[PDB]
Amino acid sequence: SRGLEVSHRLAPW
Amino acid sequence: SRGLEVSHRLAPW
Amino acid sequence: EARLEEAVNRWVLKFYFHEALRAFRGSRYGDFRQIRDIMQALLVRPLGKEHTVSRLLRVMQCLSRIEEGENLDCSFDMEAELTPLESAINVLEMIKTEFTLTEAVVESSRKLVKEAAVIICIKNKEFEKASKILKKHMSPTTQKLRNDLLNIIREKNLAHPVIQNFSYETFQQKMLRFLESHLDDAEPYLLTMAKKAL
Amino acid sequence: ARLEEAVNRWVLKFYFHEALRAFRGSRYGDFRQIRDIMQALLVRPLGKEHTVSRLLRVMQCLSRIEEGENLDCSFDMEELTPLESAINVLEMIKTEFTLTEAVVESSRKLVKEAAVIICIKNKEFEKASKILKKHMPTTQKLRNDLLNIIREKNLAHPVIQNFSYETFQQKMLRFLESHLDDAEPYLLTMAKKAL
C-alpha cells in the first residue's frame, strides 16, 4: 500500500 | 539573482 | 511506538498548516504553494497520524486543489484524467466523511466547486471537459444554472453573464471560509513559542 | 529574527540535526527524506546569516556524498558528478568555517579519491580520467595507481577492490561534524519536555 504522501497527496503529480 | 533554494541547493536537479 | 520525532513533526505540520491558511486568506497563493510543498515533503515522515492529522490534511488537499484549479494542465489524480477542481470535489466528499458533516452543510459548497469546475473549463474553451464535468456532477435545485451551463457549452458562449460574472478569487475565498468554519482556531504551539521568544 | 523566520530557523535546525543523526546511523533513506524537507524550506524566510549558511553548506556536502554512487544525477546547473560537486562544496565549507588548508586537505583527498573510484566502478573511464586530471607530490602512489587503473581499465586492482563507500561517507561525516556545534536543537529540547 501507499503511504500518506500518496493517499493524502497535497501537491499535483 | 537566484535565492537560497538554488545557491544552497540540497537536492539534485 | 514513540512520539519523539513524531511530536516535533506534528508541531511542524500544524504550524505550516496554520501559515498556509493564513497565506490563502490574505490571497498570498505563492506563499501558500511554498508552504504546501513543505507539507508534502513532511508526509513521508512519522507523524503518528490519527484522525486530527487526517482532517487537517484533507482540508489542505482541498485548498491545494482549489489553488491549482485554474491550471487545467496539472493533475492530482494518478488517473491523470481529472481537472484540479474535479479532484477538489472528490476531497470535499472525504471532508464530509472525516468531519461528519450533514449533506445540508456541504451541499452549498459542493455546488460552488462544481460550478467553478465547469466554468473554468469553459473559460479555457475546454468544452468537452466542461460537458463531462456537468454531466457527472450536476445531473434538481440548481436547475436554472445547470441549464444555463448546458446551453453555454452547447453554444460555446463565453460571452454569457454566468461566465463573465464568474470570479475565481471570490470562489476560492468562499471555499476557504467554508473549510475554516469546521476547524479549531487554535494558535499552533510553534507560533506560541516564537511569540514568547520574540 | 522575525516571527515566521524564528520558527523556520528552529525547523531547519531540527531537521539538520535529524539528518546528521540519520546519516550517522547509515539511515540514508531517512536522510534523503529530511533533505527534501529542508530543500522545501529554503524558499521560506529564514533570516539567513552566516550560521544558517554554514549549516546548509554542510548539508549540501552530505547530500552530494549520499548521492555520490549515483552518476545519473546532477547538482549543478549544467555535467558534474555528485562527488565533483561535493569537492566544490568542500571549498565553500573551508571558506565559511575559515579552515586551514591542512585541516581540509585529507578530507578533500578522500572525496577526490572517491570521485575517481566511483567512476571506475561504473566503467566511466573518461569521467574518471577528467576528474583525476582536474583534481589530482604526496598522493603520488595513489594517483599513479589510479592513472594506471584507468589506462588499463583495471577494475580488479586492490585500490578499486578494497574501496568502501560506507567507510568513505562515514569518514566525511565525522570530519564535517567536527566543525559543528553539537547543541541539541530547540524543538527537540521542547519535545523531550512535552513527553
Tab-separated table of C-alpha atoms in Angstrom:
chain	number	residue	atom	x	y	z
A	1	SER	CA	0.000	0.000	0.000
A	2	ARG	CA	0.955	3.636	-0.497
A	3	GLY	CA	1.636	5.940	2.439
A	4	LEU	CA	0.392	9.387	3.439
A	5	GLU	CA	2.404	11.228	0.772
A	6	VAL	CA	0.268	9.411	-1.806
A	7	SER	CA	-3.146	8.882	-0.164
A	8	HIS	CA	-3.142	12.406	1.321
A	9	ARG	CA	-1.098	13.937	-1.535
A	10	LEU	CA	-1.115	17.750	-1.364
A	11	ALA	CA	0.790	18.847	-4.473
A	12	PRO	CA	-0.024	17.872	-8.072
A	13	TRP	CA	1.798	14.938	-9.692
B	1	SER	CA	19.708	36.611	-8.803
B	2	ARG	CA	18.504	33.218	-7.611
B	3	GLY	CA	17.681	32.583	-3.964
B	4	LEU	CA	18.739	30.063	-1.327
B	5	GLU	CA	16.898	27.132	-2.879
B	6	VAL	CA	19.249	27.483	-5.837
B	7	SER	CA	22.511	28.763	-4.333
B	8	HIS	CA	22.390	26.395	-1.347
B	9	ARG	CA	20.543	23.679	-3.250
B	10	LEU	CA	20.459	20.447	-1.257
B	11	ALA	CA	18.623	18.022	-3.563
B	12	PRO	CA	19.867	17.064	-7.039
B	13	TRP	CA	18.295	18.883	-10.014
C	1	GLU	CA	5.950	3.449	19.187
C	2	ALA	CA	7.306	6.675	20.327
C	3	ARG	CA	6.314	10.180	19.939
C	4	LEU	CA	9.727	11.918	19.903
C	5	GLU	CA	10.312	12.765	16.210
C	6	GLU	CA	6.546	12.374	15.655
C	7	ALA	CA	5.811	15.035	18.270
C	8	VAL	CA	8.055	17.592	16.563
C	9	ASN	CA	6.749	16.571	13.130
C	10	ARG	CA	3.162	17.176	14.322
C	11	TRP	CA	4.138	20.621	15.650
C	12	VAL	CA	5.790	21.405	12.325
C	13	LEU	CA	2.845	20.130	10.261
C	14	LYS	CA	0.329	22.124	12.332
C	15	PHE	CA	2.484	25.248	12.170
C	16	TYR	CA	2.714	25.203	8.382
C	17	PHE	CA	-0.971	24.305	8.094
C	18	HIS	CA	-1.761	27.440	10.095
C	19	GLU	CA	0.580	29.513	7.885
C	20	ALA	CA	-0.901	28.044	4.710
C	21	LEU	CA	-4.426	29.012	5.778
C	22	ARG	CA	-3.134	32.452	6.726
C	23	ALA	CA	-1.481	32.890	3.317
C	24	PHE	CA	-4.561	31.657	1.407
C	25	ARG	CA	-6.737	34.060	3.440
C	26	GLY	CA	-4.548	37.047	2.512
C	27	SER	CA	-4.606	35.898	-1.127
C	28	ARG	CA	-0.894	35.084	-0.957
C	29	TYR	CA	-1.084	31.962	-3.102
C	30	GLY	CA	2.625	31.973	-3.919
C	31	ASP	CA	3.324	31.676	-0.198
C	32	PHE	CA	0.557	29.051	0.106
C	33	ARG	CA	2.149	26.883	-2.619
C	34	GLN	CA	5.601	27.118	-0.992
C	35	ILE	CA	4.145	26.039	2.354
C	36	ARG	CA	2.135	23.265	0.646
C	37	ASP	CA	5.383	21.891	-0.788
C	38	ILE	CA	6.977	21.801	2.670
C	39	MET	CA	3.943	19.929	3.991
C	40	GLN	CA	4.078	17.498	1.061
C	41	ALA	CA	7.694	16.745	1.980
C	42	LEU	CA	6.747	16.165	5.638
C	43	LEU	CA	4.197	13.476	4.743
C	44	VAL	CA	6.898	10.801	4.332
C	45	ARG	CA	7.983	11.279	7.962
C	46	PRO	CA	6.440	9.679	11.084
C	47	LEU	CA	3.547	11.877	12.203
C	48	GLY	CA	1.718	9.427	14.447
C	49	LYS	CA	-1.156	10.144	12.073
C	50	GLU	CA	-4.612	9.780	13.561
C	51	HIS	CA	-7.977	11.384	12.709
C	52	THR	CA	-6.981	15.002	13.535
C	53	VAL	CA	-3.870	14.940	11.307
C	54	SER	CA	-6.009	13.223	8.657
C	55	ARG	CA	-8.618	16.004	8.972
C	56	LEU	CA	-6.027	18.761	8.576
C	57	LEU	CA	-4.549	17.047	5.518
C	58	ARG	CA	-7.926	16.668	3.777
C	59	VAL	CA	-8.607	20.397	4.231
C	60	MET	CA	-5.091	21.121	2.976
C	61	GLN	CA	-5.684	18.801	0.000
C	62	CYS	CA	-8.894	20.601	-0.919
C	63	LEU	CA	-7.288	24.063	-0.738
C	64	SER	CA	-4.275	22.906	-2.759
C	65	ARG	CA	-6.581	21.615	-5.495
C	66	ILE	CA	-8.576	24.870	-5.438
C	67	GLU	CA	-5.371	26.927	-5.622
C	68	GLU	CA	-4.371	24.987	-8.768
C	69	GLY	CA	-7.973	24.982	-10.046
C	70	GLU	CA	-7.395	27.466	-12.865
C	71	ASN	CA	-4.479	25.361	-14.119
C	72	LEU	CA	-6.055	22.641	-16.259
C	73	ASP	CA	-2.651	21.375	-17.401
C	74	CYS	CA	-1.934	19.922	-13.954
C	75	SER	CA	-3.409	16.890	-12.193
C	76	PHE	CA	-3.670	15.461	-8.692
C	77	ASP	CA	-5.031	12.082	-9.760
C	78	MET	CA	-2.877	9.058	-10.656
C	79	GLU	CA	-5.551	8.605	-13.244
C	80	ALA	CA	-4.233	11.933	-14.507
C	81	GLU	CA	-7.588	12.493	-16.170
C	82	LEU	CA	-9.152	14.763	-13.575
C	83	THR	CA	-9.010	18.552	-13.563
C	84	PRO	CA	-7.859	20.035	-10.225
C	85	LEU	CA	-11.401	21.156	-9.266
C	86	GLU	CA	-12.793	17.689	-10.009
C	87	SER	CA	-10.246	16.333	-7.524
C	88	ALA	CA	-11.385	19.085	-5.151
C	89	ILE	CA	-14.949	17.727	-5.419
C	90	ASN	CA	-13.554	14.291	-4.508
C	91	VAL	CA	-11.721	15.648	-1.460
C	92	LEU	CA	-14.817	17.529	-0.293
C	93	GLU	CA	-16.587	14.160	-0.014
C	94	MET	CA	-13.731	12.924	2.190
C	95	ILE	CA	-14.049	16.146	4.185
C	96	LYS	CA	-17.774	15.436	4.634
C	97	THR	CA	-16.894	11.970	5.970
C	98	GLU	CA	-13.949	12.816	8.231
C	99	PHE	CA	-15.647	15.901	9.701
C	100	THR	CA	-19.003	14.043	9.823
C	101	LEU	CA	-20.897	16.871	8.122
C	102	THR	CA	-24.543	16.861	7.061
C	103	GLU	CA	-25.447	16.918	3.376
C	104	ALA	CA	-27.173	20.247	4.080
C	105	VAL	CA	-23.907	21.751	5.339
C	106	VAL	CA	-21.769	20.568	2.394
C	107	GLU	CA	-24.290	20.886	-0.477
C	108	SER	CA	-23.844	24.655	-0.862
C	109	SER	CA	-20.061	24.463	-1.045
C	110	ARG	CA	-20.083	21.384	-3.266
C	111	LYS	CA	-22.273	23.393	-5.676
C	112	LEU	CA	-19.679	26.188	-5.794
C	113	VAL	CA	-16.843	23.772	-6.605
C	114	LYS	CA	-18.954	22.051	-9.284
C	115	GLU	CA	-19.910	25.442	-10.758
C	116	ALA	CA	-16.262	26.554	-10.760
C	117	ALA	CA	-15.097	23.261	-12.303
C	118	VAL	CA	-17.422	23.688	-15.282
C	119	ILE	CA	-16.848	27.438	-15.717
C	120	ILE	CA	-13.031	27.129	-15.652
C	121	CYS	CA	-13.167	24.534	-18.446
C	122	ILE	CA	-15.492	26.836	-20.422
C	123	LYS	CA	-13.195	29.862	-19.958
C	124	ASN	CA	-10.316	27.721	-21.249
C	125	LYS	CA	-12.531	26.635	-24.174
C	126	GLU	CA	-12.355	23.040	-22.936
C	127	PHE	CA	-15.966	22.371	-23.854
C	128	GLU	CA	-15.843	18.566	-23.900
C	129	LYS	CA	-14.321	18.568	-20.389
C	130	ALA	CA	-16.917	21.044	-19.088
C	131	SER	CA	-19.658	18.922	-20.658
C	132	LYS	CA	-18.300	15.775	-18.976
C	133	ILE	CA	-17.997	17.535	-15.593
C	134	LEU	CA	-21.504	18.986	-15.895
C	135	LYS	CA	-22.894	15.545	-16.771
C	136	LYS	CA	-21.002	13.757	-13.982
C	137	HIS	CA	-21.616	16.134	-11.056
C	138	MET	CA	-24.616	18.331	-11.833
C	139	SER	CA	-27.006	15.737	-13.321
C	140	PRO	CA	-32.939	19.489	-9.124
C	141	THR	CA	-32.441	22.731	-7.177
C	142	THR	CA	-29.740	24.404	-9.236
C	143	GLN	CA	-31.750	23.672	-12.384
C	144	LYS	CA	-31.504	27.190	-13.810
C	145	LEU	CA	-27.705	27.074	-13.531
C	146	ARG	CA	-27.256	23.539	-14.912
C	147	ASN	CA	-29.433	24.535	-17.872
C	148	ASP	CA	-27.554	27.818	-18.347
C	149	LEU	CA	-24.242	25.949	-18.309
C	150	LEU	CA	-25.613	23.303	-20.696
C	151	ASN	CA	-26.639	25.984	-23.197
C	152	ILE	CA	-23.377	27.895	-22.700
C	153	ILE	CA	-21.429	24.700	-23.521
C	154	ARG	CA	-23.596	23.677	-26.487
C	155	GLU	CA	-23.406	27.201	-27.929
C	156	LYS	CA	-19.775	27.865	-26.876
C	157	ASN	CA	-20.999	31.128	-25.360
C	158	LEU	CA	-18.153	32.548	-23.263
C	159	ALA	CA	-19.812	35.966	-23.541
C	160	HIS	CA	-22.615	34.786	-21.230
C	161	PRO	CA	-23.164	36.667	-17.923
C	162	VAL	CA	-22.683	33.411	-15.950
C	163	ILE	CA	-19.187	33.089	-17.444
C	164	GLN	CA	-18.261	36.794	-17.428
C	165	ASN	CA	-19.551	37.422	-13.881
C	166	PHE	CA	-17.578	34.482	-12.510
C	167	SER	CA	-14.799	35.425	-10.107
C	168	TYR	CA	-12.301	32.716	-9.180
C	169	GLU	CA	-10.997	34.920	-6.362
C	170	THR	CA	-14.486	35.233	-4.850
C	171	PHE	CA	-14.965	31.476	-5.271
C	172	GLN	CA	-11.720	30.374	-3.622
C	173	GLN	CA	-12.151	32.758	-0.700
C	174	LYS	CA	-15.681	31.395	-0.201
C	175	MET	CA	-14.241	27.870	-0.109
C	176	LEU	CA	-11.650	28.852	2.484
C	177	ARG	CA	-14.328	30.375	4.724
C	178	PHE	CA	-16.330	27.160	4.468
C	179	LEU	CA	-13.325	24.940	5.170
C	180	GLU	CA	-12.109	27.146	8.051
C	181	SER	CA	-15.541	27.061	9.713
C	182	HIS	CA	-15.015	23.372	10.605
C	183	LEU	CA	-11.506	23.763	12.063
C	184	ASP	CA	-10.214	24.672	15.522
C	185	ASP	CA	-8.937	28.253	15.602
C	186	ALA	CA	-6.077	27.411	17.974
C	187	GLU	CA	-2.687	29.047	17.532
C	188	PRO	CA	-0.054	26.401	16.759
C	189	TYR	CA	2.428	25.604	19.502
C	190	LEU	CA	5.489	26.674	17.459
C	191	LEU	CA	3.982	30.124	16.860
C	192	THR	CA	3.120	30.473	20.561
C	193	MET	CA	6.730	29.625	21.428
C	194	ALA	CA	8.073	32.055	18.811
C	195	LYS	CA	5.921	34.860	20.212
C	196	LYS	CA	7.290	34.048	23.683
C	197	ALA	CA	10.856	34.091	22.332
C	198	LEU	CA	10.149	37.181	20.164
D	1	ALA	CA	14.636	37.190	13.540
D	2	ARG	CA	11.003	37.990	12.754
D	3	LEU	CA	8.137	35.686	13.725
D	4	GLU	CA	7.956	33.184	10.832
D	5	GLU	CA	11.750	33.375	10.443
D	6	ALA	CA	12.230	32.337	14.076
D	7	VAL	CA	10.094	29.227	13.579
D	8	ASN	CA	11.590	28.377	10.173
D	9	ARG	CA	15.050	28.546	11.808
D	10	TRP	CA	14.020	26.123	14.570
D	11	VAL	CA	12.527	23.816	11.949
D	12	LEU	CA	15.620	23.988	9.714
D	13	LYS	CA	17.972	23.263	12.620
D	14	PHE	CA	15.827	20.425	13.939
D	15	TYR	CA	15.857	18.651	10.574
D	16	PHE	CA	19.556	19.398	10.171
D	17	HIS	CA	20.147	17.600	13.476
D	18	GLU	CA	17.901	14.693	12.435
D	19	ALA	CA	19.638	14.490	9.050
D	20	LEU	CA	23.079	14.232	10.668
D	21	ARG	CA	21.683	11.606	13.047
D	22	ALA	CA	20.204	9.609	10.157
D	23	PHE	CA	23.469	9.787	8.196
D	24	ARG	CA	25.424	8.708	11.294
D	25	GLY	CA	23.307	5.563	11.681
D	26	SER	CA	23.549	4.740	7.951
D	27	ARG	CA	19.840	5.516	7.536
D	28	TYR	CA	20.357	7.162	4.161
D	29	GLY	CA	16.694	6.753	3.230
D	30	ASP	CA	15.669	8.848	6.234
D	31	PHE	CA	18.459	11.282	5.357
D	32	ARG	CA	17.117	11.841	1.821
D	33	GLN	CA	13.587	12.424	3.146
D	34	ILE	CA	14.782	15.003	5.675
D	35	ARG	CA	16.958	16.524	2.947
D	36	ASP	CA	13.825	17.023	0.835
D	37	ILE	CA	12.003	18.793	3.692
D	38	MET	CA	14.972	21.138	4.178
D	39	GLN	CA	15.119	21.810	0.426
D	40	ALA	CA	11.439	22.810	0.530
D	41	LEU	CA	12.163	25.134	3.486
D	42	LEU	CA	14.786	27.108	1.556
D	43	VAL	CA	12.165	29.192	-0.257
D	44	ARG	CA	10.798	30.494	3.073
D	45	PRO	CA	12.186	33.447	5.089
D	46	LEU	CA	14.953	32.163	7.367
D	47	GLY	CA	16.681	35.457	8.076
D	48	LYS	CA	19.724	33.769	6.561
D	49	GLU	CA	23.061	34.759	8.014
D	50	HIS	CA	26.429	33.013	8.273
D	51	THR	CA	25.401	30.232	10.699
D	52	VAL	CA	22.430	29.233	8.524
D	53	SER	CA	24.759	29.405	5.500
D	54	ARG	CA	27.253	27.163	7.354
D	55	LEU	CA	24.652	24.549	8.256
D	56	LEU	CA	23.451	24.500	4.653
D	57	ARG	CA	26.965	24.095	3.199
D	58	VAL	CA	27.488	21.051	5.428
D	59	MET	CA	24.056	19.701	4.461
D	60	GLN	CA	24.944	20.381	0.804
D	61	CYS	CA	28.151	18.361	1.115
D	62	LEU	CA	26.480	15.385	2.802
D	63	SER	CA	23.636	15.369	0.255
D	64	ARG	CA	26.120	15.187	-2.610
D	65	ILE	CA	28.063	12.404	-0.834
D	66	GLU	CA	24.848	10.446	-0.166
D	67	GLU	CA	24.068	10.598	-3.894
D	68	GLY	CA	27.734	10.010	-4.771
D	69	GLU	CA	27.381	6.470	-6.137
D	70	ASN	CA	24.618	7.685	-8.459
D	71	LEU	CA	26.354	9.091	-11.544
D	72	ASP	CA	22.967	9.595	-13.234
D	73	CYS	CA	22.093	12.567	-11.005
D	74	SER	CA	23.442	16.126	-11.016
D	75	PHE	CA	23.589	19.056	-8.583
D	76	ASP	CA	24.988	21.753	-10.877
D	77	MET	CA	23.153	23.869	-13.481
D	78	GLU	CA	24.748	22.052	-16.428
D	79	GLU	CA	27.974	17.797	-16.313
D	80	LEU	CA	29.336	17.310	-12.784
D	81	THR	CA	29.139	14.023	-10.917
D	82	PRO	CA	27.776	14.298	-7.340
D	83	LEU	CA	31.230	13.800	-5.763
D	84	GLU	CA	32.713	16.506	-8.008
D	85	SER	CA	30.008	18.807	-6.655
D	86	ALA	CA	30.946	17.638	-3.148
D	87	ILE	CA	34.515	18.797	-3.858
D	88	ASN	CA	33.158	22.226	-4.849
D	89	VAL	CA	31.067	22.419	-1.670
D	90	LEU	CA	34.107	21.471	0.424
D	91	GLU	CA	35.910	24.626	-0.766
D	92	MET	CA	32.929	26.693	0.393
D	93	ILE	CA	32.992	24.882	3.749
D	94	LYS	CA	36.680	25.818	4.056
D	95	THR	CA	35.812	29.479	3.429
D	96	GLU	CA	32.697	29.737	5.588
D	97	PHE	CA	34.192	27.791	8.505
D	98	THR	CA	37.561	29.535	7.959
D	99	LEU	CA	39.558	26.287	7.939
D	100	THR	CA	43.264	25.785	7.268
D	101	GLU	CA	44.372	24.007	4.101
D	102	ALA	CA	45.976	21.420	6.414
D	103	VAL	CA	42.661	20.592	8.111
D	104	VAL	CA	40.681	20.129	4.875
D	105	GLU	CA	43.398	18.566	2.693
D	106	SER	CA	42.993	14.999	3.979
D	107	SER	CA	39.207	15.112	3.545
D	108	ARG	CA	39.444	16.736	0.123
D	109	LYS	CA	41.771	13.845	-0.797
D	110	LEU	CA	39.158	11.284	0.321
D	111	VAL	CA	36.432	12.890	-1.806
D	112	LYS	CA	38.756	13.204	-4.800
D	113	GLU	CA	39.772	9.540	-4.457
D	114	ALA	CA	36.124	8.506	-4.115
D	115	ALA	CA	35.048	10.622	-7.111
D	116	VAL	CA	37.529	8.852	-9.398
D	117	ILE	CA	36.948	5.359	-7.958
D	118	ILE	CA	33.139	5.505	-8.269
D	119	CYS	CA	33.556	6.443	-11.945
D	120	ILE	CA	35.953	3.499	-12.412
D	121	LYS	CA	33.464	1.119	-10.732
D	122	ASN	CA	30.779	2.293	-13.170
D	123	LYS	CA	33.290	1.776	-16.011
D	124	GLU	CA	33.082	5.519	-16.683
D	125	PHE	CA	36.758	5.697	-17.542
D	126	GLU	CA	36.680	9.013	-19.405
D	127	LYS	CA	34.885	10.673	-16.469
D	128	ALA	CA	37.415	9.194	-14.033
D	129	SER	CA	40.244	10.487	-16.252
D	130	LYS	CA	38.813	14.016	-16.365
D	131	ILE	CA	38.275	14.096	-12.587
D	132	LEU	CA	41.755	12.686	-11.946
D	133	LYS	CA	43.288	15.318	-14.244
D	134	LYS	CA	41.200	18.170	-12.831
D	135	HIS	CA	41.600	17.495	-9.102
D	136	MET	CA	44.704	15.349	-8.511
D	137	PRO	CA	53.529	15.368	-4.535
D	138	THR	CA	52.010	13.357	-1.671
D	139	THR	CA	49.254	11.260	-3.248
D	140	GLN	CA	51.843	10.225	-5.845
D	141	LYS	CA	51.411	6.457	-5.431
D	142	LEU	CA	47.600	6.716	-5.467
D	143	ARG	CA	47.140	8.998	-8.484
D	144	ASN	CA	49.716	6.909	-10.356
D	145	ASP	CA	47.810	3.780	-9.346
D	146	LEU	CA	44.591	5.467	-10.477
D	147	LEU	CA	46.190	6.699	-13.724
D	148	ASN	CA	47.274	3.116	-14.438
D	149	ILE	CA	43.901	1.672	-13.365
D	150	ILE	CA	42.087	3.982	-15.798
D	151	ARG	CA	44.572	3.455	-18.640
D	152	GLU	CA	44.313	-0.341	-18.296
D	153	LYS	CA	40.594	-0.435	-17.351
D	154	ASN	CA	41.702	-2.473	-14.343
D	155	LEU	CA	38.629	-2.982	-12.135
D	156	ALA	CA	40.415	-5.824	-10.327
D	157	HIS	CA	43.106	-3.600	-8.740
D	158	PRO	CA	43.291	-3.646	-4.885
D	159	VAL	CA	42.762	0.146	-4.856
D	160	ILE	CA	39.394	-0.455	-6.525
D	161	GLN	CA	38.502	-3.722	-4.767
D	162	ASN	CA	39.290	-2.535	-1.235
D	163	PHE	CA	37.315	0.684	-1.639
D	164	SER	CA	34.400	1.042	0.766
D	165	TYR	CA	31.876	3.788	0.064
D	166	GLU	CA	30.351	3.273	3.521
D	167	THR	CA	33.756	3.792	5.157
D	168	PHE	CA	34.336	6.881	2.992
D	169	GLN	CA	30.977	8.570	3.639
D	170	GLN	CA	31.211	7.931	7.392
D	171	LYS	CA	34.715	9.469	7.472
D	172	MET	CA	33.324	12.520	5.660
D	173	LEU	CA	30.507	12.815	8.190
D	174	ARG	CA	32.955	12.663	11.125
D	175	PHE	CA	35.049	15.382	9.509
D	176	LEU	CA	32.059	17.632	8.836
D	177	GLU	CA	30.530	17.090	12.280
D	178	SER	CA	33.842	18.029	13.919
D	179	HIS	CA	33.390	21.680	12.864
D	180	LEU	CA	29.797	21.908	14.054
D	181	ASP	CA	28.419	22.811	17.450
D	182	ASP	CA	26.776	19.685	18.853
D	183	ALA	CA	23.992	21.601	20.631
D	184	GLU	CA	20.575	19.937	20.851
D	185	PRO	CA	18.036	21.777	18.678
D	186	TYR	CA	15.297	23.765	20.450
D	187	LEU	CA	12.384	21.736	19.037
D	188	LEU	CA	13.941	18.501	20.261
D	189	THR	CA	14.521	20.030	23.704
D	190	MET	CA	10.859	21.096	23.684
D	191	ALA	CA	9.686	17.628	22.601
D	192	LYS	CA	11.601	15.906	25.411
D	193	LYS	CA	9.974	18.347	27.846
D	194	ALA	CA	6.473	17.706	26.478
D	195	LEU	CA	6.907	13.929	26.639
